[PDB]
């Protein structure tokens, strides 16, 4: 989940994206956010290949 | 005949009772501080020693008089019950911290130095000139009764 | 705590909770104003008494020429209480009593609002106690902190009890003294007004022990009646020679003294509300307690405040004994 | 004052704790001479059945464990587990919870003081500023041994007073049908423990009411 407090652990997204006026006419932001890991449940049948050339 | 028992006390948002929130982004209460976990010479077996509210200086070393107060530290990797971590890091690996200094409001019966004594009048007026409100007019002192 | 394999079952939850008072509510003893200003007026008509006389068939007549009045006015304090709640407080965290569900925002607001409404109903029950003794409730603040028996241009009767007199009976002591002033002053149209003594446990402890009374507390059942005198206190009960004696239980009496009123007299005890320090209800009316809960239009924080303020009045300090003794 | 800072609430507690259960078995067998060829007892001639012992004695298993249970019902109260001949689950509540047991000593050869009043000051107050909120119509009870309430009531300081109770038949409607003596004063309830748990010389107090304070749990 995104660190803002509308879903603290509730639930998950790719990608979240924000877009802030004031409400004042006068200035606006933008957001985003993200996280997740990359894993390889089984490193046993990745096989490194190192080559010697010339 | 143990009767094995696990306990915690306070939370995050009882240290910082209030924020100020600038409109244009989120950090700008906050400064990030990098600091040693465990300590330099005990085991990868010891939870450190960086209880939530303790006062750290300008470059991560805690806190042992007024001279020495930047930022209160308020990382999400020390807070009461957040007890996973103890092996994950090795004796004198260095991590990155999070410490609040500008428009905070600050518990001060909760604040104290890395010893464990209770902040002053220093102190006070140290962090107070970041721009933080540091109150004693805080309910809930007394337990239950007894 | 030995690792997952040991699939875990349900597990139970209890609390604790300070304690309420609820005696001075559970009699009904005070009523309630709303009003608009920081001041509250209190007006007191004062009637004049006669005894008439026999006349002739002609002659001259008699008349009735009597009257006075006064007119008094007070501030109000204020009491805040406020409360903000962060994304680390709740995420990736259990409820304490349900294992393995998560936590939600929904019940610490829920329950941070019990704790709020707690804690204002011990400042209103600690509140009421103060008008007893003859004085208003602000700690920390020497703006509305009113002296009633002054304001009102009275005095205390002290009715003082030597419990180490053991040839003289003490509760023979406070009917000659206080009960007696408390009816003459008492005033015409109180209709069931009952005299009670409100005592600290030592004054009482000692008032029981006197031998002159052990023969008549020993006589008496001092068993269950407090479930239907009143309505749940545990506070022992003493009632002899029509007079109601109570232990304060919630320590509101110094140690050593004891207070005697009349209850009944419609309009003797009241509280005064005042609005809210904000913008839409600056001059409106006012209530019991407000309560703003606001979240964050950039979803991340959170906030809760409450808001009240109030004064209780005692209108006839003239109508109060204040009690002492030696132990 | 009307503008300046507010105030906050920033305080609570958390306590978690585990504990073991134990085990009590219980199991009888019948064997073809012990019911053929004999009467049942109450019935003169009539020739003795299966089913009559089976359920004799299941009635006399589910006695058996009817007064297990109440046997260790009490074991609550003073502040232990009941497990014999098992140090596995024989658990000291006062320390694993971190408190202490508040003692409040009566001298009963102490004629001139009332043994019931020191009660009054010792243990009645404090076990009502610890009580808690949210406890509605928890009653003080005092429950104790039969030499201890011999003595108690024989005290001098007390023989006024318990003269002048009934002591007639109110058991029966304070309670729902057990013989003990009742003594009710300076809204204390005393009572005699009959079956023998209560240590001779001893008594203890507990307030009754105050949901979820006993719990039974089954596995």
């Given at each position: 989940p995104s660190?803002?407090?509308?879903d603290a652990?509730?639930?998950?997204?790719?990608?979240?994206?924000?877009?802030k006026?004031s409400?004042?006419?006068r200035?606006?932001?933008?957001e985003?956010?993200?996280?997740?890991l990359?894993?390889?449940?089984?490193?046993?049948?990745?096989?490194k290949?190192?080559?010697?050339f010339? | 005949?143990?009767?094995?028992v696990?306990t915690l006390?306070?939370?995050?948002?009882d240290?910082?009772?209030?924020?100020?929130?600038?409109f244009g982004?989120t950090?700008?209460n906050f400064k990030?501080?990098?600091?040693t976990?465990?300590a330099?010479?005990?085991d990868?077996?010891?939870k450190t020693?960086?209880?939530?509210g303790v006062?750290?200086?300008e470059?991560?070393?805690?806190?042992?008089?007024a001279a020495?107060?930047?930022g209160?530290?308020?990382?999400?990797k020390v807070?009461?019950?957040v007890d996973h971590?103890i092996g994950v890091f090795?004796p004198g690996?260095?991590v990155?911290?999070?410490?609040?200094?500008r428009?905070?409001?600050?518990?001060?019966?909760?604040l104290?130095?890395?010893?464990?004594?209770?902040?002053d009048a220093?102190?006070?007026q140290?962090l107070?000139?970041?721009?933080?409100?540091?109150?004693?007019?805080?309910?809930?002192?007394?337990f239950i009764?007894? | 705590?030995n690792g997952?394999?040991?699939?875990?079952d349900?597990?139970?939850?209890?609390?604790?909770m300070?304690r309420?008072?609820?005696l001075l509510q559970?009699?009904?003893?005070?009523?309630?104003?709303?009003?608009?200003?920081?001041?509250?007026?209190?007006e007191?008509?004062?009637?004049?008494?006669g005894?008439?006389?026999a006349?002739q068939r002609?002659?001259?007549?008699?008349?009735?020429?009597?009257?006075r009045?006064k007119?008094?006015?007070?501030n109000?304090?204020?009491?805040?209480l406020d409360?903000?709640?962060?994304?680390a407080?709740?995420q990736?965290?259990?409820?304490?009593?349900?294992?393995?569900?998560?936590?939600t925002?929904?019940a610490?607001?829920?329950?941070?609002?019990?704790?709020?409404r707690?804690?204002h109903?011990?400042?209103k029950?600690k509140?009421m106690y103060?008008?007893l003794?003859?004085?208003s409730?602000?700690?920390?603040?020497?703006?509305?902190?009113?002296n009633?028996?002054?304001?009102w241009?009275?005095?205390?009767?002290?009715?003082?009890?030597?419990?180490t007199?053991?040839?003289?009976?003490?509760?023979?002591?406070?009917?000659?003294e206080?009960?007696?002033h408390i009816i003459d002053?008492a005033?015409?149209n109180?209709?069931?007004?009952?005299?009670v003594v409100?005592?600290?446990?030592?004054?009482?402890?000692?008032?029981?022990?006197?031998?002159?009374?052990?023969?008549?507390?020993s006589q008496?059942?001092?068993?269950?009646?407090?479930?239907?005198?009143?309505?749940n206190?545990?506070?022992?009960?003493?009632?002899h020679?029509?007079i109601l004696?109570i232990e304060?239980?919630?320590g509101?009496?110094p140690?050593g003294?004891?207070?005697?009123?009349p209850?009944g007299?419609?309009?003797?005890f009241?509280?005064?509300?005042?609005?809210?320090?904000?913008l839409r209800?600056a001059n409106?009316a006012?209530q019991?307690?407000?309560?703003?809960?606001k979240?964050?239009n950039?979803?991340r924080?959170?906030?809760?405040?409450?808001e009240t303020?109030?004064?209780?009045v005692?209108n006839?300090?003239?109508?109060?004994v204040?009690?002492?003794?030696?132990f």
């Amino acid at each position: 989940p995104s660190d803002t407090l509308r879903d603290a652990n509730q639930a998950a997204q790719e990608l979240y994206v924000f877009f802030k006026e004031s409400n004042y006419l006068r200035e606006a932001k933008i957001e985003s956010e993200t996280s997740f890991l990359t894993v390889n449940n089984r490193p046993e049948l990745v096989v490194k290949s190192t080559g010697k050339f010339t | 005949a143990k009767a094995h028992v696990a306990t915690l006390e306070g939370n995050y948002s009882d240290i910082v009772l209030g924020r100020v929130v600038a409109f244009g982004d989120t950090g700008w209460n906050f400064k990030e501080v990098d600091m040693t976990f465990i300590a330099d010479d005990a085991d990868a077996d010891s939870k450190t020693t960086l209880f939530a509210g303790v006062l750290v200086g300008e470059d991560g070393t805690p806190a042992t008089a007024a001279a020495g107060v930047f930022g209160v530290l308020v990382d999400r990797k020390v807070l009461p019950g957040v007890d996973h971590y103890i092996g994950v890091f090795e004796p004198g690996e260095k991590v990155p911290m999070v410490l609040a200094v500008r428009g905070l409001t600050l518990n001060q019966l909760k604040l104290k130095y890395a010893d464990g004594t209770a902040i002053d009048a220093a102190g006070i007026q140290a962090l107070e000139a970041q721009g933080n409100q540091v109150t004693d007019k805080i309910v809930g002192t007394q337990f239950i009764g007894s | 705590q030995n690792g997952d394999f040991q699939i875990l079952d349900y597990t139970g939850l209890i609390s604790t909770m300070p304690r309420v008072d609820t005696l001075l509510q559970s009699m009904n003893l005070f009523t309630e104003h709303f009003g608009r200003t920081t001041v509250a007026r209190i007006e007191r008509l004062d009637d004049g008494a006669g005894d008439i006389k026999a006349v002739q068939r002609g002659g001259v007549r008699q008349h009735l020429a009597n009257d006075r009045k006064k007119i008094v006015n007070l501030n109000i304090p204020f009491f805040p209480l406020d409360r903000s709640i962060d994304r680390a407080d709740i995420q990736n965290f259990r409820e304490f009593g349900t294992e393995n569900a998560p936590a939600t925002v929904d019940a610490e607001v829920q329950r941070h609002m019990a704790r709020i409404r707690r804690s204002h109903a011990i400042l209103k029950s600690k509140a009421m106690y103060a008008a007893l003794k003859g004085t208003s409730w602000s700690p920390d603040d020497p703006v509305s902190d009113y002296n009633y028996y002054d304001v009102w241009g009275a005095t205390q009767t002290t009715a003082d009890v030597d419990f180490t007199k053991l040839g003289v009976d003490p509760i023979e002591v406070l009917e000659a003294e206080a009960r007696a002033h408390i009816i003459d002053w008492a005033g015409d149209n109180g209709d069931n007004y009952e005299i009670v003594v409100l005592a600290s446990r030592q004054w009482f402890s000692a008032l029981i022990a006197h031998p002159q009374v052990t023969g008549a507390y020993s006589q008496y059942p001092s068993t269950q009646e407090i479930l239907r005198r009143r309505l749940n206190a545990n506070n022992r009960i003493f009632e002899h020679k029509n007079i109601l004696f109570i232990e304060d239980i919630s320590g509101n009496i110094p140690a050593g003294e004891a207070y005697i009123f009349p209850r009944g007299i419609s309009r003797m005890f009241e509280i005064y509300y005042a609005p809210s320090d904000t913008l839409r209800d600056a001059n409106q009316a006012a209530q019991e307690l407000y309560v703003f809960f606001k979240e964050s239009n950039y979803l991340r924080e959170a906030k809760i405040e409450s808001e009240t303020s109030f004064l209780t009045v005692n209108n006839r300090p003239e109508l109060v004994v204040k009690s002492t003794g030696k132990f």
